[PDB]
């Protein structure tokens, strides 16, 4: 399947809740690395990175990010001045990463933002930087003269992918796991709406549908948002609000990884009945 490696850096001016610089590394959107300017140490966040990399790897990662912290410190001071906002609490963000497809083909991105809005973005096809506003144009010219786009593209297409392949091997079992949803039909009151709740599944893609008697039914259906669990799994629910349900046989069908689970009215649970 497709896999990705992504880094997200957060720079902050003025405390206290968070340090000046925070970095998080993720494979398939799951954190495997952490760093901040309080501890000045890069640390592992998953078993698979722990068991496959050690002191040398982390010393180097720490060293790179200490530099990142220093650069972010200087960068945010500059952009704040350009917005004449140097007094208040502000933010400087960087996200970049690569994707490796079954294909063998790859994708990559490199972006920066100030106060949560686009500043400069990499176009690795034209090897230029897209400036979102006048404040970013000076940076665009500077970076294009320093060949930053060429270096970034080089990293995204080579270094990033080479390490992603390593990481995928390290955590193959976890990253390629397929966990079916646990499904329940919830109802507060015999007269209340009924919720089809699916949880503990991975990957996050899931489809919840209602049927009446039935071939499927999508009137009076409220599909909720995909939500993250605390353990890296996901959950999602859908609510049915229909008229007195009594004379018609409703059911919930949850599909995940080409497999379906059905729950009927006989399955409905509640507090305290």
């Amino acid at each position: 399947g497709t896999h990705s490696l992504k880094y997200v850096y957060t720079g902050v001016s003025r405390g206290i809740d968070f340090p000046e610089f925070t970095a998080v590394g993720m494979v398939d959107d799951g954190q495997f690395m952490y760093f901040d300017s309080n501890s000045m140490k890069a640390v592992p966040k998953t078993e698979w990175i722990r068991q496959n990399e050690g002191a040398d790897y982390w010393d180097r990662q720490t060293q790179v990010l200490i530099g990142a912290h220093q650069v972010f410190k200087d960068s945010i001071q500059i952009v704040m001045e350009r917005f004449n906002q140097s007094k208040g609490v502000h933010t400087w963000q960087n996200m970049y990463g690569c994707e490796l497809n079954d294909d063998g083909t790859t994708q990559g991105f490199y972006q920066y933002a100030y106060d949560g809005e686009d500043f400069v973005s990499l176009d690795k096809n034209t090897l230029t930087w897209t400036a979102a506003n006048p404040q970013a144009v000076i940076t665009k010219h500077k970076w294009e003269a320093l060949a930053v786009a060429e270096q970034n593209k080089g990293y995204l297409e080579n270094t990033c992918i080479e390490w992603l392949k390593k990481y995928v091997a390290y955590g193959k079992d976890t990253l390629e796991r397929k966990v079916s949803p646990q499904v329940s039909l919830l109802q507060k009151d015999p007269s209340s709406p009924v919720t089809c709740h699916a949880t503990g599944f991975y990957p996050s893609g899931v489809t919840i549908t209602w049927q009446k008697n039935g071939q499927d039914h999508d009137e009076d259906v409220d599909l909720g948002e995909l939500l993250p669990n605390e353990d890296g799994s996901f959950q999602r629910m859908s609510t049915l609000n229909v008229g007195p349900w009594k004379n018609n046989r409703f059911s919930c069908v949850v599909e995940h990884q080409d497999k379906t689970i059905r729950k009927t009215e006989d399955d409905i649970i509640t507090n305290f009945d």
Binding site: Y7, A23, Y57, Q61, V64, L65, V79, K142, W143
Partner: peptide, 9 residues
């Protein structure tokens, strides 16, 4: 592994 090369804006 993080990109070792950064430039200030």
């Amino acid at each position: 592994f993080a990109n070792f090369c950064l430039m200030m804006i």
